[PDB]
Amino acid sequence: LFKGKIPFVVELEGDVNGEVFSVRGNGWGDGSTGKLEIKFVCTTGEVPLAWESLICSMALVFCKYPSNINDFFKSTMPRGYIQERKISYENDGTFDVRQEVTYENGALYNRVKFNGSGFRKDGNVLGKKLDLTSIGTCIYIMGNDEGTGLKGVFNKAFKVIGGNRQIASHVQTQTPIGDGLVSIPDYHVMHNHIACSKDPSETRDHIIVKESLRAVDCNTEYM
Amino acid sequence: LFKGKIPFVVELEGDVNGEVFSVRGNGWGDGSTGKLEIKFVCTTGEVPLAWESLICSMALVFCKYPSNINDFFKSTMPRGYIQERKISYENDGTFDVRQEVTYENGALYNRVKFNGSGFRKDGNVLGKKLDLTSIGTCIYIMGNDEGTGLKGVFNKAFKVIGGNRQIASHVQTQTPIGDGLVSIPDYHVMHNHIACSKDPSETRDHIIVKESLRAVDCNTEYM
């Protein structure tokens, strides 16, 4: 299903320190090259927080997997998987995020419930002081202890506009939505790249995201 | 000072859940290739915990740095730097670690105070149920907020013998020991590899470690 560009559609309902907002993204992902491009629009007016804080919540199924690592994400399709994260910001609040990642009508949908609490008034998140202009991130992927799904961990070192860097710590799980046979990997990493940009022509609150995604047998490739 | 193999000497005084032990390592590191080899011996009898839990505490100065990233570690030599870590194990205790990394008499010394508390009796650390046979780790390196030193973060996904994987979360700082001019980088990563082995000939409690260390401009290389 993932040999070639396919539509990538995102629906995020957000609730951060009791500020409710909706985001819709349309673009494309290519699971054989590990590339995607998508434009996110806030449909309820303006995001009450850093766009950058939304980006990883808004499709690791598009990751370019080598043939020697089990690709859990593609193995669950078309029914797909649940992707859940706790994201903890150094000196700031916490996001609780639940995603349904499914293949429907020839398209990959990321449907996201994005909740945040404890965020600080003069913090980088509510202050919108974060930047992902061009940034590499390494994500740890492995089988959960029961061998029914995935767990993972990673940091993002967000650029802080007029500051230094802000670490957000992510804990993730992925569990299949269906009862079909799934493929469980051992420990590996994703080398991921984000570039975020704004259309100066566009008048609505939005952000354009390009990602690169590659699964890496770091146990071999780091030697 | 780091163009070619030079002696690498480690002295670790350890205190884990009130169990005191000493480790001495001798080997070599090569800062131009980013390789090192060292054999660690417990001099007080036996390590009262997983060797694997000691390995990253027991010389990022040996990291192969490209010319487009500031190499803080080599910029501090010969006086060298302090390297401090809090290491937190999922469902287990915490290590507090202070290192002095100095160049003395043509050799690179890592002098380590390794403290651990809250470790669980039937846990993977005191139970010695961890393995680093062949494992890749990605370390985040960046300038601290004051621009006087480094901060960093990383996970190690330890193999658990007869289990799955155990995440240890590391927070690190590096601060110069001297008053000399130091070179402060922006965010990048190290792709590091560990291979641990035992000499079946050797009769003392020991472990042999080979590391690969490369500094990576992930903001470019992950695209």
Numbering used by the authors:
A (entry chain A), B (entry chain A): 7 to 64, 68 to 232
Question: Can you list sentences taken from the study reporting this PDB entry?
Answer:
In addition to transcripts encoding an FP clearly homologous to A. victoria green fluorescent protein (avGFP), as we expected, the A. cf. australis transcriptome also contains several transcripts encoding other, much more divergent avGFP homologs. Characterization of the recombinant proteins revealed that these avGFP homologs include a green-emitting FP that appears to be the brightest FP discovered to date, 2 long-wavelength-absorbing CPs, and a reversibly photochromic FP. We have identified several new Aequorea FPs with the potential to further diversify the landscape of fluorescent probes and biosensors.
